[PDB]
Protein backbone atom coordinates (compact mmCIF):
# COMPACT_ATOMS: atom_id res chain seq x y z
CA UNK A 1 0.00 0.00 0.00
CA UNK A 2 0.91 3.64 -0.53
CA UNK A 3 0.84 4.57 3.18
CA UNK A 4 3.08 3.79 6.09
CA UNK A 5 1.03 2.24 8.91
CA UNK A 6 1.97 2.87 12.55
CA UNK A 7 0.13 9.19 15.89
CA UNK A 8 2.94 8.79 13.36
CA UNK A 9 5.32 7.80 16.16
CA UNK A 10 7.12 4.81 17.66
CA UNK A 11 6.83 3.42 21.19
CA UNK A 12 10.43 4.53 21.82
CA UNK A 13 10.34 7.63 19.59
CA UNK A 14 7.40 9.79 20.64
CA UNK A 15 6.90 13.32 21.97
CA UNK A 16 7.80 13.72 25.63
CA UNK A 17 10.09 10.69 25.83
CA UNK A 18 13.31 11.26 27.77
CA UNK A 19 16.57 9.34 27.50
CA UNK A 20 19.71 9.38 29.59
CA UNK A 21 23.21 8.07 29.10
CA UNK A 22 26.52 9.38 27.87
CA UNK A 23 28.85 10.35 25.10
CA UNK A 24 32.36 8.93 25.13
CA UNK A 25 35.65 10.70 24.52
CA UNK A 26 39.21 9.43 24.80
CA UNK A 27 39.60 10.60 28.41
CA UNK A 28 36.19 10.04 30.02
CA UNK A 29 32.46 9.63 29.49
CA UNK A 30 30.14 12.63 29.79
CA UNK A 31 26.55 12.57 31.06
CA UNK A 32 23.94 13.14 28.32
CA UNK A 33 20.19 13.69 28.52
CA UNK A 34 17.90 13.77 25.49
CA UNK A 35 14.28 14.86 25.29
CA UNK A 36 12.19 14.07 22.23
CA UNK A 37 10.04 17.14 21.55
CA UNK A 38 8.28 16.34 18.25
CA UNK A 39 7.91 13.27 16.05
CA UNK A 40 6.28 13.35 12.61
CA UNK A 41 7.06 10.21 10.65
CA UNK A 42 5.87 10.14 7.02
CA UNK A 43 2.42 9.02 6.05
CA UNK A 44 3.22 8.18 2.41
CA UNK A 45 5.86 5.94 0.84
CA UNK A 46 6.07 8.44 -2.02
CA UNK A 47 6.15 11.42 0.31
CA UNK A 48 6.93 14.94 -0.84
CA UNK A 49 7.50 16.28 2.67
CA UNK A 50 10.90 17.56 3.81
CA UNK A 51 9.85 18.49 7.35
CA UNK A 52 12.09 16.93 10.05
CA UNK A 53 10.81 13.60 11.32
CA UNK A 54 12.06 14.28 14.86
CA UNK A 55 13.15 17.23 16.96
CA UNK A 56 14.48 17.32 20.46
CA UNK A 57 16.88 18.66 23.07
CA UNK A 58 20.37 17.27 23.75
CA UNK A 59 22.15 18.14 27.01
CA UNK A 60 25.73 17.28 27.94
CA UNK A 61 26.69 17.89 31.57
CA UNK A 62 29.95 18.78 33.30
CA UNK A 63 31.91 19.15 30.11
CA UNK A 64 34.86 21.15 31.45
CA UNK A 65 35.75 22.49 34.93
CA UNK A 66 34.13 25.81 33.91
CA UNK A 67 31.27 24.65 31.64
CA UNK A 68 28.56 22.80 33.54
CA UNK A 69 25.98 22.24 30.80
CA UNK A 70 25.68 22.54 27.02
CA UNK A 71 22.11 22.33 25.71
CA UNK A 72 21.29 22.10 22.01
CA UNK A 73 18.16 21.70 19.92
CA UNK A 74 18.40 19.11 17.18
CA UNK A 75 16.36 18.08 14.18
CA UNK A 76 16.52 14.77 12.44
CA UNK A 77 15.33 12.25 9.92
CA UNK A 78 14.42 8.58 10.27
CA UNK A 79 15.72 6.28 7.54
CA UNK A 80 12.84 4.61 5.73
CA UNK A 81 14.78 3.13 2.75
CA UNK A 82 12.42 4.91 0.29
CA UNK A 83 12.47 8.74 0.29
CA UNK A 84 15.16 8.61 3.04
CA UNK A 85 17.52 5.70 2.25
CA UNK A 86 20.62 4.75 4.22
CA UNK A 87 22.90 6.68 1.84
CA UNK A 88 22.48 10.44 2.30
CA UNK A 89 23.54 11.15 -1.29
CA UNK A 90 20.23 9.58 -2.32
CA UNK A 91 18.10 11.75 -0.04
CA UNK A 92 16.06 14.48 -1.79
CA UNK A 93 18.35 16.98 -3.54
CA UNK A 94 17.41 19.87 -1.25
CA UNK A 95 19.61 22.43 0.50
CA UNK A 96 17.80 21.99 3.83
CA UNK A 97 19.31 18.47 3.93
CA UNK A 98 22.93 19.51 3.29
CA UNK A 99 23.89 19.19 7.01
CA UNK A 100 23.16 15.45 6.86
CA UNK A 101 25.32 14.66 3.81
CA UNK A 102 28.39 12.50 4.02
CA UNK A 103 30.46 10.40 1.66
CA UNK A 104 28.82 7.11 0.82
CA UNK A 105 31.71 5.27 2.49
CA UNK A 106 31.11 7.25 5.70
CA UNK A 107 27.42 6.38 5.80
CA UNK A 108 28.06 2.72 4.92
CA UNK A 109 30.74 2.24 7.57
CA UNK A 110 28.81 3.98 10.36
CA UNK A 111 25.54 2.14 9.79
CA UNK A 112 27.36 -1.19 9.56
CA UNK A 113 29.24 -0.40 12.80
CA UNK A 114 26.06 -0.78 14.87
CA UNK A 115 26.30 -4.46 13.97
CA UNK A 116 22.67 -5.32 13.23
CA UNK A 117 22.68 -5.95 9.47
CA UNK A 118 23.15 -9.29 7.79
CA UNK A 119 26.37 -10.02 5.95
CA UNK A 120 24.77 -10.59 2.53
CA UNK A 121 24.31 -8.26 -0.45
CA UNK A 122 26.50 -5.34 0.69
CA UNK A 123 27.12 -2.83 -2.09
CA UNK A 124 28.81 0.52 -1.57
CA UNK A 125 27.09 2.03 -4.63
CA UNK A 126 23.46 1.13 -3.89
CA UNK A 127 21.25 3.66 -2.08
CA UNK A 128 20.53 1.30 0.86
CA UNK A 129 23.89 -0.49 0.55
CA UNK A 130 22.01 -3.57 -0.63
CA UNK A 131 20.26 -3.92 2.74
CA UNK A 132 16.62 -3.21 1.79
CA UNK A 133 14.61 -5.83 -0.10
CA UNK A 134 10.99 -5.36 -1.01
CA UNK A 135 10.20 -8.38 1.18
CA UNK A 136 11.98 -6.62 4.06
CA UNK A 137 9.52 -5.23 6.56
CA UNK A 138 8.81 -1.53 6.30
CA UNK A 139 11.14 0.55 8.44
CA UNK A 140 8.92 0.93 11.52
CA UNK A 141 8.26 -2.83 11.64
CA UNK A 142 11.96 -3.74 11.86
CA UNK A 143 13.70 -4.15 15.21
CA UNK A 144 16.31 -1.47 14.56
CA UNK A 145 15.56 2.10 13.47
CA UNK A 146 18.25 4.32 11.96
CA UNK A 147 18.22 8.11 12.26
CA UNK A 148 20.43 11.12 11.74
CA UNK A 149 20.33 14.05 14.17
CA UNK A 150 21.75 17.53 13.46
CA UNK A 151 22.07 20.12 16.22
CA UNK A 152 20.88 23.52 15.02
CA UNK A 153 20.58 25.80 18.06
CA UNK A 154 22.40 26.38 21.33
CA UNK A 155 19.92 26.89 24.16
CA UNK A 156 20.30 28.55 27.54
CA UNK A 157 20.27 26.77 30.91
CA UNK A 158 16.45 26.95 30.86
CA UNK A 159 16.19 25.45 27.35
CA UNK A 160 19.82 31.55 22.34
CA UNK A 161 22.13 31.12 19.34
CA UNK A 162 21.93 29.46 15.94
CA UNK A 163 24.78 27.04 15.46
CA UNK A 164 27.15 26.94 12.52
CA UNK A 165 29.93 24.58 11.60
CA UNK A 166 32.73 27.16 11.98
CA UNK A 167 32.08 28.59 15.46
CA UNK A 168 32.26 26.65 18.69
CA UNK A 169 32.56 26.60 22.46
CA UNK A 170 35.60 25.80 24.55
CA UNK A 171 34.97 22.09 25.01
CA UNK A 172 32.33 21.46 22.32
CA UNK A 173 32.13 21.97 18.58
CA UNK A 174 29.19 21.66 16.26
CA UNK A 175 30.31 20.84 12.74
CA UNK A 176 28.88 17.31 12.44
CA UNK A 177 25.80 15.17 13.01
CA UNK A 178 24.95 11.91 14.81
CA UNK A 179 24.31 8.54 13.24
CA UNK A 180 21.77 6.96 15.60
CA UNK A 181 20.31 3.50 16.05
CA UNK A 182 17.28 2.66 18.22
CA UNK A 183 16.48 -0.92 19.29
CA UNK A 184 12.68 -1.03 19.38
CA UNK A 185 12.66 -4.17 21.55
CA UNK A 186 14.61 -2.62 24.45
CA UNK A 187 14.57 1.14 23.86
CA UNK A 188 18.35 1.24 23.86
CA UNK A 189 19.97 3.85 21.63
CA UNK A 190 23.49 4.05 20.29
CA UNK A 191 25.04 6.71 18.13
CA UNK A 192 28.23 8.10 16.68
CA UNK A 193 29.16 11.73 16.10
CA UNK A 194 30.63 12.33 12.64
CA UNK A 195 32.36 15.07 10.72
CA UNK A 196 35.49 14.53 8.58
CA UNK A 197 37.40 17.19 10.54
CA UNK A 198 36.66 15.47 13.88
CA UNK A 199 38.05 12.30 15.41
CA UNK A 200 35.85 9.30 14.69
CA UNK A 201 33.55 7.33 16.95
CA UNK A 202 32.61 9.49 19.92
CA UNK A 203 29.82 7.18 20.97
CA UNK A 204 26.38 7.99 22.33
CA UNK A 205 24.57 5.49 24.54
CA UNK A 206 21.08 6.17 25.86
CA UNK A 207 18.20 4.36 27.53
CA UNK A 208 14.67 5.70 28.16
CA UNK A 209 14.39 7.28 31.58
CA UNK A 210 10.71 8.26 31.88
CA UNK A 211 8.76 5.22 30.65
CA UNK A 212 7.14 4.81 34.08
CA UNK A 213 5.84 8.39 33.86
CA UNK A 214 4.48 7.86 30.34
CA UNK A 215 2.81 4.57 31.35
CA UNK A 216 1.22 5.99 34.51
Amino acid sequence: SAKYTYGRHLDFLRPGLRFGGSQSSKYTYYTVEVKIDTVNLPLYKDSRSLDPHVTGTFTIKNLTPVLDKVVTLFEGYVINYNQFPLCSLHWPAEETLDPYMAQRESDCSHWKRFGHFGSDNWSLTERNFGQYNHESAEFMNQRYIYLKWKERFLLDDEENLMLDDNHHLEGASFEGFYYVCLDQLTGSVEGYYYHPACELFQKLELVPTNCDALNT
Binding site: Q23, S25, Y27, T28, Y30, I60, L63, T64, P65, V70, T72, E151, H168, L169, E170, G171, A172, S173, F174, E175, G176, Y193, H195, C198, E199, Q202
Partner: peptide, 8 residues
Amino acid sequence: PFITSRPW
Protein backbone atom coordinates in the same frame (compact mmCIF):
# COMPACT_ATOMS: atom_id res chain seq x y z
CA PRO B 1 28.43 18.11 19.75
CA PHE B 2 31.99 16.88 19.31
CA ILE B 3 33.67 16.89 22.73
CA THR B 4 37.05 18.65 22.72
CA SER B 5 37.56 18.81 26.50
CA ARG B 6 41.07 18.32 27.84
CA PRO B 7 41.77 15.63 30.45
CA TRP B 8 40.40 16.63 33.84
